[PDB]
Write an enzyme that holds these catalytic residues in place. Structure first.
Site, PDB file in Angstrom:
ATOM      1  N   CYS A  64       0.875  -1.353  -0.218  1.00  0.00           N
ATOM      2  CA  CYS A  64      -0.059   0.160  -0.141  1.00  0.00           C
ATOM      3  C   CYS A  64       0.758   1.662   0.011  1.00  0.00           C
ATOM      4  O   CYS A  64       1.149   1.496   1.120  1.00  0.00           O
ATOM      5  CB  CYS A  64      -0.381   0.415   1.418  1.00  0.00           C
ATOM      6  SG  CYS A  64      -2.107   1.806   1.324  1.00  0.00           S
ATOM      7  N   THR A 133      -8.051  -0.551   6.605  1.00  0.00           N
ATOM      8  CA  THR A 133      -7.828  -0.247   5.574  1.00  0.00           C
ATOM      9  C   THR A 133      -5.937  -0.470   6.232  1.00  0.00           C
ATOM     10  O   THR A 133      -6.170  -0.103   7.769  1.00  0.00           O
ATOM     11  CB  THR A 133      -7.526   1.256   4.858  1.00  0.00           C
ATOM     12  OG1 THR A 133      -7.892   2.081   5.426  1.00  0.00           O
ATOM     13  CG2 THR A 133      -8.948   0.731   3.568  1.00  0.00           C
ATOM     14  N   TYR A 196      -6.025   4.820  -9.413  1.00  0.00           N
ATOM     15  CA  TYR A 196      -6.656   3.264  -9.446  1.00  0.00           C
ATOM     16  C   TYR A 196      -8.236   4.146  -9.285  1.00  0.00           C
ATOM     17  O   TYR A 196      -9.464   3.355  -9.890  1.00  0.00           O
ATOM     18  CB  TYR A 196      -7.129   3.955  -7.308  1.00  0.00           C
ATOM     19  CG  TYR A 196      -5.892   3.193  -6.427  1.00  0.00           C
ATOM     20  CD1 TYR A 196      -4.723   4.279  -6.657  1.00  0.00           C
ATOM     21  CD2 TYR A 196      -5.483   1.870  -6.521  1.00  0.00           C
ATOM     22  CE1 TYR A 196      -4.143   3.850  -5.823  1.00  0.00           C
ATOM     23  CE2 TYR A 196      -4.484   1.993  -5.646  1.00  0.00           C
ATOM     24  CZ  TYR A 196      -3.739   2.439  -5.718  1.00  0.00           C
ATOM     25  OH  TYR A 196      -2.593   1.753  -4.582  1.00  0.00           O
TER      26      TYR A 196
END
Lengths: 327, 320
Positions: A64, A133, A196
């Site tokens: 990430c 997340t 994204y």
């Protein structure tokens, strides 16, 4: 931050679900129904979360780019000894971020030894409705989530832990702050979230805009970085860290997997030596786990890459010499 | 050949979605410029079925244009978008025509007509005889050499893409780039396992780097003159940076990032007539829309801004 893969799950009123259809109509409607964690660690005697030496714990994935922001800052500041870290499994499925300590590069939940990251959220907020997340800044004293935002965790790592940092580095220096805050805000949508938006695009027109704005933004900062070494110019700042975590993943993932295929980052005259200049900044290289990056994006997104084949990608010589010290 | 996961088939004459090449029939007859042959070269007899998207069919178009057989051999263009029923005819669509022979809706009809109970895959190119009312040939390389050598009597330009003194190298290059380059990208693209993909990518870019080394000192693949071998390479190279690189995840390096392979591609593109045989929109639409298990949401990638028309310096090397 805003765009999520087609099979991403959710916590609803403290309950794990594969999908909640009543909250998923229209562009990113669930997130407008979501709770986040925005407390700050503040060097202030009156403040709730004061900076201590062995108190706050960090949860990250090496894949990430948002979590990676916290890692680059932690390394630059020399806050490893002060702030501990757990690394979640780069592969995830129906249970979200999971802990797989035997796997290379991964560890266990140092705090509560949980199987999944969603357990940690539930402990902190038993009725929370959000996305599970990374990154997550955890307080071991109050036993809860302090902050959940990459941008702010990076900032407080930068400006609030001066007593325990090993390096006298200032990634938010006087006279640059206003511009640093500006650059971070600008590159946020077309570059950080843009890839994204292009990758999880479900219609042609949204993809077209996401790609057009992205490479337009990249071309702008490429011209800017022709006469100044860093984004804010003379000095290394948080603005560079935000840009770096995207660029470092562009040619191996974003370009092919997310179909942002107008141009390689390495084909840019100034962005590529810039990326090499950042990668070779002492300490940063060890925060880059490409094996985690490629494994996550190519095998965790079924509706983007069904057969979960990890693409090979270019032979990128990050350690190739630059000449941007002449700036 | 490697076909996409949703590729349907003709089985004993029947059209079916689900069940193989080694169980399949093909069409391998030839046109021969000899007095006895079944199919002899004529000036208005044979019909070519192509798709602007498919690189295999693209070979036949390039050769047809080079020789000057546009007036001799007619052509039909199927719809780039394919689905449940295989290649289809959609005359309204830009670039597409209708079946000039039997006004057929789906190319599979023509296959069944030519062979009532055939077991095969409905593919392009298709060379059709309007006299016997059947398929002549079905392979790219055979139709290409057919167009190149046998139709000299009906040509318009005196070009020789298979000249004496160069022939032996031509043929060997053709099947030396078949598996690693021409068919390799599809091996990598439709790969379901990690290990074959790794191999497919390795051999493909190993092969590309090779001919990039060779073409550094010589203008064309067989050396001195333009050649069928260049036609086989071109129909793949011109689809790489826009499709193969991204869509089929052959993303080790752009074709434009090569020292010699890129101006070489620009050299072939700008050769007279080859410019008009390229329909990038057909190419980009087909691969990004007709492969549901490669690109589920069927979004067409933008791709790089390639200037094929940009001036080069390989005329400095001796050739046509």
């Amino acid at each position: 931050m805003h765009h999520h893969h087609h099979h991403m799950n959710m916590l609803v009123d403290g309950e794990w679900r594969t999908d909640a259809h009543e909250l998923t109509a229209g562009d990113g409607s669930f997130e407008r129904q979501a709770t986040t964690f925005r407390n700050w660690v503040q060097d202030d005697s009156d403040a709730r979360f004061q900076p201590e030496a062995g108190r706050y714990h960090l949860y990250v994935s090496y894949a990430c780019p948002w979590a990676h922001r916290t890692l680059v800052t932690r390394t630059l500041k020399g806050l490893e000894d002060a702030i501990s870290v757990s690394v979640v499994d780069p592969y995830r499925a129906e249970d979200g971020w999971q802990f797989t300590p035997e796997k290379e590069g991964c560890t266990h939940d140092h705090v509560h030894d949980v199987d999944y990251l969603r357990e940690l959220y539930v402990r902190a907020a038993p009725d929370v409705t959000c996305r599970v997340t990374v990154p997550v800044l955890w307080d071991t004293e109050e036993d809860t989530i302090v902050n959940n935002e990459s941008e702010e965790i990076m900032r407080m790592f930068d400006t609030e832990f001066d007593e325990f940092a090993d390096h006298t580095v200032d990634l938010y220096p006087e006279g640059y702050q206003e511009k640093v805050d500006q650059i971070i805000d600008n590159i946020y949508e077309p570059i950080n979230n843009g890839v994204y938006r292009a990758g999880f695009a479900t219609e042609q027109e949204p993809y077209d805009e996401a790609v057009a704005e992205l490479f337009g933004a990249l071309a702008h900062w490429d011209d800017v970085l022709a006469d100044q070494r860093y984004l804010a110019g003379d000095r290394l700042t948080e603005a560079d860290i935000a840009m770096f975590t995207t660029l470092v993943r562009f040619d191996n993932v974003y370009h092919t997997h997310f179909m942002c295929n107008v141009q390689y980052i390495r084909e840019f005259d100034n962005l590529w030596p810039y990326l090499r200049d950042l990668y070779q900044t002492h300490g940063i290289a060890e925060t880059v786990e490409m094996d985690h990056i490629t494994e996550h994006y190519y095998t965790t997104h079924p509706d983007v890459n069904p057969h979960r084949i990890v693409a090979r990608g270019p032979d990128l010589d990050f350690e190739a010499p630059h000449s941007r010290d002449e700036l």
